[PDB]
Amino acid sequence: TLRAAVFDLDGVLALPAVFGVLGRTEEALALPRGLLNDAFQKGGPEGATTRLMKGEITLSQWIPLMEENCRKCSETAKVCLPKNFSIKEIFDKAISARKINRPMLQAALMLRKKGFTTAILTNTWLDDRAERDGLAQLMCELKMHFDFLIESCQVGMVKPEPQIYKFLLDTLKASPSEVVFLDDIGANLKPARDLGMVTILVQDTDTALKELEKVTGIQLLNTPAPLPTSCNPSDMSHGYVTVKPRVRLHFVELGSGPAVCLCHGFPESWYSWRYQIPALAQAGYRVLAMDMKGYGESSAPPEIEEYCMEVLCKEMVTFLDKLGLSQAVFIGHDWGGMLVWYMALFYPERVRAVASLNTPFIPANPNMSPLESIKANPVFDYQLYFQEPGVAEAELEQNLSRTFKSLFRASDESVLSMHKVCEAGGLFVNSPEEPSLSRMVTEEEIQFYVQQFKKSGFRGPLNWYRNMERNWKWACKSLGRKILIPALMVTAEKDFVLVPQMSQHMEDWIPHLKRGHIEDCGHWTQMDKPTEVNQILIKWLDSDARN
Amino acid sequence: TLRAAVFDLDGVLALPAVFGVLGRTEEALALPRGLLNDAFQKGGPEGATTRLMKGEITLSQWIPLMEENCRKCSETAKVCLPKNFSIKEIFDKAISARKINRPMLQAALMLRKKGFTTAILTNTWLDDRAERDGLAQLMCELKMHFDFLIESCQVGMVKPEPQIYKFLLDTLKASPSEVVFLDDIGANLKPARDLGMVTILVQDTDTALKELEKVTGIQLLNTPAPLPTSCNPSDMSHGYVTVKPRVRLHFVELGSGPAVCLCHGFPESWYSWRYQIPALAQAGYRVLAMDMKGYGESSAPPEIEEYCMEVLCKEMVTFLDKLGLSQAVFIGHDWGGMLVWYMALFYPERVRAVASLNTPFIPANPNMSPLESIKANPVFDYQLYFQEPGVAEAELEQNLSRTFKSLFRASDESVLSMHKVCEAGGLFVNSPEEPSLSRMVTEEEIQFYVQQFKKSGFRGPLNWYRNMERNWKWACKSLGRKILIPALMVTAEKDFVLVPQMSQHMEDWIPHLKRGHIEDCGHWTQMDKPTEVNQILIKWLDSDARN
Numbered sequence A, B: 001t002l003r004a005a006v007f008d009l010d011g012v013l014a015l016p017a018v019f020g021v022l023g024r025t026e027e028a029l030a031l032p033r034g035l036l037n038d039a040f041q042k043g044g045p046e047g048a049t050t051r052l053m054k055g056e057i058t059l060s061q062w063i064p065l066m067e068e069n070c071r072k073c074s075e076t077a078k079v080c081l082p083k084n085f086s087i088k089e090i091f092d093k094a095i096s097a098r099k100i101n102r103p104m105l106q107a108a109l110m111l112r113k114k115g116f117t118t119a120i121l122t123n124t125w126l127d128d129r130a131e132r133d134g135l136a137q138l139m140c141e142l143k144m145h146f147d148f149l150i151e152s153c154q155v156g157m158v159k160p161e162p163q164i165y166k167f168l169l170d171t172l173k174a175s176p177s178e179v180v181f182l183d184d185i186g187a188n189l190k191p192a193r194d195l196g197m198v199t200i201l202v203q204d205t206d207t208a209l210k211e212l213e214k215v216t217g218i219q220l221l222n223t224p225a226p227l228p229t230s231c232n233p234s235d236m237s238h239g240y241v242t243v244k245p246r247v248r249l250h251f252v253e254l255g256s257g258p259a260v261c262l263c264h265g266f267p268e269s270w271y272s273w274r275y276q277i278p279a280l281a282q283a284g285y286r287v288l289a290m291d292m293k294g295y296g297e298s299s300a301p302p303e304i305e306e307y308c309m310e311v312l313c314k315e316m317v318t319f320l321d322k323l324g325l326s327q328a329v330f331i332g333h334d335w336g337g338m339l340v341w342y343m344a345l346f347y348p349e350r351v352r353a354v355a356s357l358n359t360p361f362i363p364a365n366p367n368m369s370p371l372e373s374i375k376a377n378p379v380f381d382y383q384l385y386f387q388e389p390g391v392a393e394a395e396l397e398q399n400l401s402r403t404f405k406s407l408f409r410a411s412d413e414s415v416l417s418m419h420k421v422c423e424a425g426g427l428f429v430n431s432p433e434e435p436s437l438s439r440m441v442t443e444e445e446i447q448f449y450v451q452q453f454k455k456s457g458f459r460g461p462l463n464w465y466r467n468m469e470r471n472w473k474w475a476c477k478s479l480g481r482k483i484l485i486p487a488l489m490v491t492a493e494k495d496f497v498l499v500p501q502m503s504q505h506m507e508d509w510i511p512h513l514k515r516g517h518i519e520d521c522g523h524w525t526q527m528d529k530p531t532e533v534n535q536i537l538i539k540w541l542d543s544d545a546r547n
């Protein structure tokens, strides 16, 4: 029966309720009970606060008016107000103190994930305070999680006025019968209840969620920790920068703050950071998730040398140049990780900080040739299979869906053996024709990769493996250097190709290297342990890259 | 004969020369003359500094080595070094003290503008200091103005080694004969002189430029103040955000720092800010130059209501939402200016600061209808001509080149009479079929507008004028508000349509409104007085929008 849930902001999606700062201030100030509240509702429908809530005047215009009210209220009450009594001071602190009620938001998200039309109905104001950004960021984060956001000051109506509930119903495209409305102010529930829609008087969150869980018949409480926010491609800002006549790089951008450049591995895409893009943006950074040369909407020239590390890094430098960025924090995974270590070794000036997931920084061996070194590692056999131009391309391109379903698997869902590849004569030789769906990815996400790779195939992507000799000679130019800028290395316990122990010596080249380690995490780190990754990166960014 | 000019960095394009900080430190510290310098060149080709300059070790690795050298040099000299002697301290201050020698850069720019192949040849290091960003930003600004940047630490070679000069010649694709090289270190000039290329020992800039002017036969000194940097479309990062199913907004982005959203007028484009995009980016901001709905690469739906101010503003809010931006400074011109005032009146929370060029904020008249108000102003007659769907479209689209050449004109190049439009039955009725080229724009720039408008024509752009009634009713909702966030209003003396006096009352709605006024400046403000505009905006941004 129910199809939509509407949540109030103050006291429901955000706490502590700003409206509740009036009472707390009275006790603290030994003022008569309810004094500040009376001054707040002085005049009712025709009072300053209602005009404020309807958008007739701004918050800064309202402040002086609320002040006179407090005086007039203390006058009939025969009481004085402290000398440093400041309404601006009072609300500034209350507003900034108000945080998102995560469990309430989580419940909204769940209901929405299960087909519910969600909305926010709140009496609010046009905030033009010097500190408005705080409220802006909070609304910015909530907004994306709901189908609709109905703000009183925006629609000229305010609860309890029944007209706004009709507006709600019309916006929702649902009859009262199929709508549950949560509010902490009983008065606001009556109008909704009269229309016949379900209502929940929200005092304490748990109780409120128990009623909500009961009435909707969906688990909302004591539910498992959910996956972080994953962005939708069509809702992202897409950027394109031509770094060379035939080479254009594509990236998705979100957030403000220090620039953080994400560099995916093989055979992935910017979408491989879908879980950290919103998280890092949310943490105060300007995220630039790349489509590395050879992938997605980025150019994919056929020439092998177009993908040697030196060229790839120059291009990323040019990328910063064209965007007018003197630096960016570089965070890479797999092949992208190799690239950031080198960005730091050859262009320290442009790297604010560097971080790699799984991919350890290993210096070139002045003596042993790349081919030799690689043959000395059974698990790296597959890299030899990628050498001959065209072969690997045919196998990986034959059935894209199969390709990504076979590759993108958790540590214990494996179906491939990177060690017996050349021997087997292929990468999927003894792999299912129709692999099951990895717990890490949905059928939709798999198809996103599928469509991205239909554009350029695996030639460009595979070419990254075809410059061993060139990359070796280039890297040798840096054997005398050291990475002295902030650096983070995150190892993945169950990554059987890029094993943790491979990074054990890194300290010799990065003295102040900081670390991170994720257990029971395979090679596809971002997808596997998104929550751990975000927490590790954000912690690191806030302490070493933000300064 | 000459075809290329190569400039050294330290002492030529940047001053004061960092290399010259060694001597100044010796005097200040009463140390033996040349002591610090000796420690700097200790070992010659095999010394620490040469390895540093060749990219073998990083600057931070070099510091400790330079320290030991200073000790060893003071030992043979039988002298001690102050207790708080710090090489890091010394170079940090020197490096950050080093600024771009504007007159030298200006000369390079001129030569390049006249067909010269320009380049930078400098012995430098991989800077991994905690303060590297300073040098990064300086190189970031210089880089774009030259065809090539040859850094010693990047090519493993260093002056005076003749091999690097051959590398230079090869990179330049020019024989010695047609190359002039400027350096402040005589030793570095000999190798070049031996190959036969012209050389200039640069002590003082003026003298150096006199020699350069003489040898190239081009005015480089005492030359007029040049136009600020104007960006090239193909070198910009292009962003696209879908704000609604059928509406995608395009923008050009440059720089880092607070977000600054530029909103052009009618009938323009993001390219109308070509002169301020680099300037504002350079001043420490992240510039987002929009293609306003209905223009360039932004969507242009046919429906008239798709362009009423309320919808246009909601879309810009969504634009910020999708980009993960809680706020942006909004700077608009002409119709874009009208839009920012309203962004500030209805979404103060999202506007960090607001600024308008030419377009004054005028509140709706509760009594007089829009049509009536507009008819009461002879100069606004043209707005009536734009009402009938299709008419204005035909005239403006008939000959695009003519359209923009006729419109984009300085205060004293006018050929149109906005006042007798309806009477004349057209906008170009008594205008040249082949207007001359305005001093404000080149034939190329005119063609850029031409190609942009070939995509959607003037329907969408003209639709901005077709929502008077709707915009009026919407604006009436704000008659009780005031703009209390930082606001800037820049009037243009010779703008005969958006006249300065039209903004005289603005203070009544924006008490703390700051102002700016550009003399002998027409309607096309950005194009007309780019230098004045940049200076006025940057000054305002740094004091009111940066905080």
Ligand SMILES: O=C(O)CCCNC(=O)NC1CCCCC1
Binding pocket: A266, A334, A335, A338, A359, A407, A416, A418, A497, A498, A523, A524
């Ligand atoms: O998940 C899998 O089974 C294989 C993934 C393929 N990854 C790489 O080839 N990484 C290289 C990055 C650069 C250093 C060498 C390994």
Ligand SMILES: O=C(O)CCCNC(=O)NC1CCCCC1
Binding pocket: B266, B334, B335, B338, B359, B407, B416, B418, B497, B498, B523, B524
């Ligand atoms: O340069 C010229 O001759 C005409 C330029 C056309 N500009 C406008 O129509 N501006 C409107 C902005 C919104 C307020 C009314 C004027």
Ligand SMILES: [Mg+2]
Binding pocket: A008, A009, A010, A011, A012, A183, A184, A185
């Ligand atoms: Mg409430």
Ligand SMILES: [Mg+2]
Binding pocket: B008, B009, B010, B011, B012, B183, B184, B185
């Ligand atoms: Mg020099």
